[PDB]
Amino acid sequence: DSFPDGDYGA
Amino acid sequence: GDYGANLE
Amino acid sequence: TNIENIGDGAEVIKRTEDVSSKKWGVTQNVQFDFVKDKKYNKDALIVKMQGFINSRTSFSDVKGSGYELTKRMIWPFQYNIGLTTKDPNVSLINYLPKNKIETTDVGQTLGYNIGGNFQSAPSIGGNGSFNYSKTISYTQKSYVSEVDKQNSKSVKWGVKANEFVTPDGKKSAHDRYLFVQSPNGPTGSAREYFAPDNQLPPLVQSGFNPSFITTLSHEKGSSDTSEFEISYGRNLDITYATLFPRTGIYAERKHNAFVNRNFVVRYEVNWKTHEIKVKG
């Protein structure tokens, strides 16, 4: 939730 | 996946 | 609610909105000051954009065969701040900063005098000649501020990486080895392949606290409301560092790796009631 969709690729 | 978890 | 008499029959009606996004790592803390002056044929709304944009700096392993000794650092090459409108009844009549500024500290003032007279100075403290004034103040160590776009309907600033103090002297923001270092040993940790926090300036380590102004102009008697959007965000680069036991640390940069990672908020101004609402 505190990050964009995909979380930079994580 | 392509990358490990994001470290601060 | 917050009304200031500014002399000669004029007043300023002050509104604020605070809108954040934990997803985008942004807080927009915006001040909207309506200039209500019978001697000016237009309504004016001084919009001061403050808040916070997280750097979103991170460090991680790169998975897959051949990438076991490759690590990455994601970091903000530029902070994006902009305000745009498509409403025919509103135009932008000034913006601050108005020009490129490369000093670590930025401090400027917008002044208003009765009769629709705006003036800007790239300093704070100059003269007590204005009926009303608003200032901007921010720090951008190693970064520079540019006006990426400016016209009657939109303004966009970019606060962009420029030159960094490094143990081996000054390094350009385009140096592929910027922030790269040899780790102590082969014992993992993506973090160890990059410069420690004490070598990273605030815009890389933490984030940016914007402070920008633009004034919206509206003909009195045109429609009661206007919509506009404020966008805060960043463009991120990636620096990859690969450890080669016999030839050392090898670095590559993916420039503009994630562009326009922005939080956009749509606002509505009601010129008749002197109110601001967030649309979403």
Numbering used by the authors:
A (entry chain M): 34 to 43
B (entry chain B): 39 to 46
C (entry chain A): 30 to 309
Mind quoting what the paper says about this structure?
Staphylococcus aureus (SA) leukocidin ED (LukED) belongs to a family of bicomponent pore forming toxins that play important roles in SA immune evasion and nutrient acquisition. LukED targets specific G protein-coupled chemokine receptors to lyse human erythrocytes (red blood cells) and leukocytes (white blood cells). Each leukotoxin is made up of two subunits of approximately 30 kDa: a host cell targeting S-component (HlgA, HlgC, LukE, lukS-PV, and LukA/G), and a polymerization F- component (HlgB, LukD, lukF-PV, and LukB/H), which can bind the plasma membrane through highly conserved phosphocholine binding sites. Each toxin is composed of two domains: a central β sandwich called the CAP domain and involved in inter-protomer interactions, and a RIM domain which contains several divergent loops driving host cell specificity.
Unexpectedly, we found two bound copies of the peptide, which may be due to the potentially very high peptide concentration used during crystal soaking experiments. Residues 34–43, and residues 39–46 are visible for the 1st and 2nd peptide, respectively. The first peptide interacts with site 1 through its sTyr41 residue in a manner similar to the pCS molecule. The preceding residues 36FPDGD40 close the back of the binding pocket, decreasing the solvent exposed surface area of sTyr41, and provide additional stability through multiple intermolecular interactions. Asp38 forms a salt bridge with LukE Arg290, and Gly39 carbonyl oxygen is hydrogen bonded to Arg101 from site 2. The 2nd peptide sTyr41 residue interacts with site 2, in a way that is also similar to pCS, although Arg101 sidechain adopts a different conformation and an additional salt bridge is formed between the sulfate and Lys283. Other stabilizing interactions include several backbone-backbone hydrogen bonds between Asp40-Lys92, Gly42-Asp90, and Leu45-Phe88, and hydrophobic interactions between Leu45 and Phe88, Ala219 and Arg220 of LukE. Although the conformation of both peptides is stabilized by multiple interactions with LukE, it should be noted that the 2nd peptide chain runs with its C-terminus going away from the putative location of the membrane. In addition, the occupancy is relatively low (except for the sulfotyrosines) and the conformation of the peptides is likely influenced by crystal packing and the associated steric constraints.
